[PDB]
Amino acid sequence: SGGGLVKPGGSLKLSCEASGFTFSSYAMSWVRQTPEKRLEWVASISSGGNTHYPDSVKGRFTISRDNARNILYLQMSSLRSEDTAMYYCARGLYYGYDEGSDFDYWGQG
Amino acid sequence: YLPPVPVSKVVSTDEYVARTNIYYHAGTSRLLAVGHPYFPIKKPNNNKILVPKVSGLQYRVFRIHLPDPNKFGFPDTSFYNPDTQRLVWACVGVEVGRGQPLGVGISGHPLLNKLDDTENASAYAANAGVDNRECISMDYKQTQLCLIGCKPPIGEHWGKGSPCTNVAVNPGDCPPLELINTVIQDGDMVDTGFGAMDFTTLQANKSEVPLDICTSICKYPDYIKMVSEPYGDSLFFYLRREQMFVRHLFNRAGAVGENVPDDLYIKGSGSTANLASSNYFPTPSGSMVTSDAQIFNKPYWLQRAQGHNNGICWGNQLFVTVVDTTRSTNMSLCAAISTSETTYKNTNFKEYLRHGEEYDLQFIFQLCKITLTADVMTYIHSMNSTILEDWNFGLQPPPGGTLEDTYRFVTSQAIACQKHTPPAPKEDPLKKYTFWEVNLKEKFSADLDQFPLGRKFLLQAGLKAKPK
Amino acid sequence: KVVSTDEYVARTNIYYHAGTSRLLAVGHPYFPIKKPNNNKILVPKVSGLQYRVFRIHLPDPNKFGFPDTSFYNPDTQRLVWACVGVEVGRGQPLGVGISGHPLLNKLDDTENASAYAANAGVDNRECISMDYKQTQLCLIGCKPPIGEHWGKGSPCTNVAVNPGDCPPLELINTVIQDGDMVDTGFGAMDFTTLQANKSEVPLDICTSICKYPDYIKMVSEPYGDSLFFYLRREQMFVRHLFNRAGAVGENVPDDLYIKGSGSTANLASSNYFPTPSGSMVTSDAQIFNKPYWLQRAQGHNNGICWGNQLFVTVVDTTRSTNMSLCAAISTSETTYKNTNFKEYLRHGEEYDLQFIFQLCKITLTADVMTYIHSMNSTILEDWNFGLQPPPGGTLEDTYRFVTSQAIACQKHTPPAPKEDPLKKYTFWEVNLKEKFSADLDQFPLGRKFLLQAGLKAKPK
Amino acid sequence: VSGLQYRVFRIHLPDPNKFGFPDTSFYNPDTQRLVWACVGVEVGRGQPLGVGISGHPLLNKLDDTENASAYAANAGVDNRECISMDYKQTQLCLIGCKPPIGEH
Amino acid sequence: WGNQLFVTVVDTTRSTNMSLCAAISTSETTYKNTNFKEYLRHGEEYDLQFIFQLCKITLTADVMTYIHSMNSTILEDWNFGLQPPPGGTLEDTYRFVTSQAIACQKHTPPAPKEDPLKKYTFWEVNLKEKFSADLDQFPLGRKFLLQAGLKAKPK
Amino acid sequence: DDLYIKGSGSTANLASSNYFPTPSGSMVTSDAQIFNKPYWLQRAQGHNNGIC
Amino acid sequence: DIVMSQSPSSLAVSVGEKVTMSCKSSQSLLYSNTQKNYLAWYQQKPGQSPKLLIYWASTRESGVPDRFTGSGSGTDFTLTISSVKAEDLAVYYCQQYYSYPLTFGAGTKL
């Protein structure tokens, strides 16, 4: 939601907004686009706001969850141009018996 | 019936292992190496080396293969059945031959990041110029060590870590540091006393140190972690000696990026208005060599080792690591582009640097057998299963289960060559890791008498007479 | 450490037999029939040259319980057929087909020329047919037949390949099926793949890959169960000698020779191909249709057979004759004209099988429960002592769906009748199941054995 | 490469006297030695059987000698022709510790 | 003798030569002698399986003599560097001068050890690794058994 | 067609596909004669033994 | 990690052809206490967004026709489709969520 021209090395400030729904109901994440069709993954944080970080961005991608604005946010700085990508938002949900995961929606990207 | 009742603790390998009556020896003739100390020589446009970089300052790895004992000849094998049992080598004693005349080399750099001599200063120095770097050389700390185990030597070093991201790194800012373990590789560099780390990443000047270590990562072994192995199979033994002393007192020349708060001092004026570089570095120095300190040219006797592994070498496989500074002398020769003129001309000579290397190995081994039960199989399988694979498992069921086997179309094929271009599958899982190689597998002897070292083995234990 | 079957094996005293009806078979020599616009086949091309492969479908013995069941526990063991014996019906009087191609690359003879040839018209293709390697074979065993045959090799990237270059080279080693290509020995491979020309060969042999056994690797099975048996026989040699005519792949170094000029200036065919001669036939050459036997074989398998299931293959040249028809679309006119006659062909084909068998019984140990499980577990799949106690008690009914509010709509699950894995492989199939019965008194043949047995024949 | 090329197979064995047994006590390795012996041998050959052939584009030839209606023509220069033939059919096998000796 | 064995065999029967054609232009639909080059390759298929027996030799003079007469090079590869028991040959033995590549290579000197027939080239195979101690596992061998019978075995 | 390639000229048209062999009898011998020699029956594949 | 696995790249299914694709995790997919396979998927077409395929292989999304129904448990799986169709033409990503991070298939472009 809003992503665009950024020259690497600075800080990167982006948003993912809800559209006509309760924001605090389910899980949320950030995503990126690596053109090989080999996709790379960006960021996540819990409902309780625990940082979901891989071997990579732990403490790196600096996230701010906002339920009120119904928007997901992320902070970066001293950017990695290896993070050049078309970034995507994503969301979570809960579907509770069979134990395998469908997905309802995600952001503007 | 069922898998067994059995835990992992560790055990003293002598629990299950049985010691045999027989010993063998083999050894290489000798090993030579030659190369340039400071950097490898390649064809300038090419990436292929014309000349390798060689110095005592580089680590040396040695992989030694043994043949499968269960294929191997004895005067008396009666004592076992391959049905129920393995055989595995055991290394009782080890030698390192070293023949070179002992003497010191040296290294340096033609542009050395340097300010001045702070050891004694009669007056306030000048102000930072542009490019004051200088041509200076030094001696590294003297060192000896030896390393033995069936698992590769694990070194460690400093390194630049991923900074935890809150503040954006501005160019100029101290990267955080990370202590990092890694596999020790051949050609890797001894520390100089400047610390086991990567200069390349952490130092952008590239003029901070002499050549040899500049681009590389000096590493140092961590006895802790190594000894912290449960099976102790990294090494079951070693020895170490080293020394160094201070020589000179210098500074780094560059901008200050951590400035000194005044409170530590008082503000000066004139020449004292400006703080000189608080960077200092000592000049490392080795001392006089002695024949006595030599850890070499003497037999060793291992019976009880700190690791529960006792001289057991798994996978027909044994390692040695060697580091020596005493033979480090680099010889310098000159060749004259004109043999005619009778007046000395600098311009006439092409100066050259080469360095000699001498290695040898003489190895004693005991043979050992393994009785097999589940618990047996279990524990090992638990420890490492791969060994069982090179092994036939003595059996997979009780009669020899087979996999719809391998019979091949290959050995010499038709020159299409995806019928091989790709030879051996599986792996040496370390195949990525490069290091020196030798094969002894043809070199064994059933008689020690013939050999210089062997009789000592007798001698030390007595010969009694030599039977069996 | 494979062992003989009969290590553990436990025999019966007991035997049954079946034999087919026979074989009703026919069809066209050259190519199969279909609607011209369509791909839907009217009628099969059928040939001997189509590899001759047939496979076995039989009841679980354990299905039948016995007038005396007593002698064993069905549970503490299993109960497993062995093949005692075998026979093929093969009934046709023996016959000659023969072929070639209406267009052919040829320059000409080698042997006989008074002078060097003339210039080459382009597309000089000609119509000639040939005979073949004279051959029968039979193939006997339980694991799939697999033919090994040439291939084009993998050009690696070193040499940049130029238009028209030599395909690199291969042997391909691959499953046999029925109705596949005999060689005359023109190479075990597909020119259709591996020859541009498409004018080079008999049409039929244009089609597909010549295939030939690999004993060696079938020899090389861990258990030798592809076959435990076969026989192999043939005769042939060359009839004539003929040059191809085509653009040059490569040429001969001169140093190897001298130079002509004028007429003699110019290159004599390096394209050199023989014309084979397949031979006479005889009755005595017949290997067929005779009591056929084993006990010991090269393999641990002795009659060791699974899925109640076995593969059978044989091949014969001998009968290769077809016969055609002269179709007069008008009979009316009494005066002759070539006009009125279309021609059609098929190749009629015939066989039968009668085979003797045993059962054997198998108790259970890990070895049992493993060695084959080891060897292959697929049979204890077919058995029930593969275990597998599972979890998983409970669920929820929820009903009903039709209410038109939506709970997720449902199950897809015939899913896996699929059992033959190799099922996509397509070839002849013979189900035998209920043809079994007791006494060869009734069964035309293996009482042959019963006399080979002898044993007293029992009273009335 | 062609079939008509002779084949020569050299086969190395490892020294027995480096290589031991499940039970070796039955001998003294010192006072004696060990040597392999060859009891039996096999040759596998897998190809579908068939005859090849060779020829030459130029060959010294006059004409048919079998039947001639009239006397032959005058000999020109280079009447050589392209003709081919089949070689004599043959099979052989050779085994020993010393190389096969040829003659010509 | 000398861990060495020869086999030589020739067959005419498989002489078949397959011939294939490659098209330099795949487009044109009119047949032309132009478009097709021709190549000729020939297949070759061998295998070897060899039984072996194991034997020992007592030593006396007559022994040693008799052999030394036949071919004395044989003794070399054994012990008996010298006619009788002692052992072997007492000038210095082993040396290697390289590792990595600058200096005049280890092979700048000739190879001292020889099969003197090294002049004579021909096809080669190494078996050294392949031995097995149990016939049962092989197609051929069990016949050897069968020829001599001698069956029984574990479970 | 796909089983071949178009001709032209002389090859404009396709000759008849048909072929049939000409059977040829072989050398006859006195041996293979099966006659003028006695026969002796005891057991036959059928259950009849020489019953007419 | 497990970067999910679909390779080599070129295969295709013409008029009336069931599809062949195989995505395989590099960790064992028979798991202890939970015992329900976790597998994720996607479809990237021209004209709209790249989108999930399948979840738990026996439970399908609405707005997802049943045409995709897979089989197997554990590392590798087997798909079966009575009739494969056009929009089945697509890039099929694959994934598992139990142990995060989220990593992706070598992909099915079939």
Author numbering:
A (entry chain A): 7 to 82, 82A, 82B, 82C, 83 to 100, 100A, 100B, 100C, ...
B (entry chain C): 12 to 479
C (entry chain D): 20 to 479
D (entry chain H): 65 to 168
E (entry chain H): 325 to 479
F (entry chain E): 273 to 324
G (entry chain B): 1 to 30, 30A, 30B, 30C, 30D, 30E, 30F, 31 to 104
Authors' text:
The infectious HPV16 has a T = 7 icosahedral capsid (55 to 60 nm in diameter) comprised of 72 L1 protein pentamers. The apical surface of each capsomer is comprised of the antigenic loops (BC, DE, EF, FG and HI loops from each L1 protein) that connect eight antiparallel beta strands (BIDG and CHEF). An extension of the L1 C-terminus, or C-terminal arm, links capsomers together and provides stability due to the formation of disulfide bonds between 175.CYS and 428.CYS from two neighboring L1 proteins. First generated from mice in 1996, H16.V5 (V5) and H16.U4 (U4) are two distinctive monoclonal antibodies reactive to surface conformational epitopes on the intact HPV16 VLP.
Here we present the near-atomic resolution structures of HPV-V5 and HPV-U4 complexes at 4.7 Å and 5.8 Å resolutions, respectively. Since U4 Fab only bound in the canyon around the pentavalent capsomers, the asymmetric unit for HPV-U4 included six L1 proteins and one U4 Fab. U4 Fab was built with the heavy chain relative to the light chain (heavy chain followed by the light chain) around the five-fold vertex in a counterclockwise direction. The U4 Fab was observed only in the canyon between hexavalent and pentavalent capsomers with most of its body inside of the inter-capsomeric space. Specifically the U4 epitope was comprised of residues from the C-terminal arm of a hexavalent L1 protein (431.HIS and 437.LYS) located adjacent to a pentavalent capsomer and three residues from the EF loop (180.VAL, 179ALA, 176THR) of the pentavalent L1 at the edge of the capsomer crown. The C-terminal arm from one hexavalent protein and the EF loop from a pentavalent L1 protein contributed to the binding with U4, which bridged the two neighboring proteins. Two of the five residues in the epitope of U4 overlapped with the known heparin binding site. The mass axis of L1 proteins in pentavalent and hexavalent capsomers in the HPV and the HPV-U4 Fab complex maps indicated negligible rotational and translational movements of L1 protein as a rigid body after U4 binding. The distance between Fabs in the HPV-U4 complex was 96 Å between two neighboring U4 Fabs bound around the pentavalent capsomer, whereas the angle between two neighboring Fabs was 45°. Thus, even though the geometry of binding might allow intact U4 antibody to crosslink capsids, we propose that direct interference with receptor binding and blocking the accessibility of the canyon are the main neutralization mechanisms for U4.
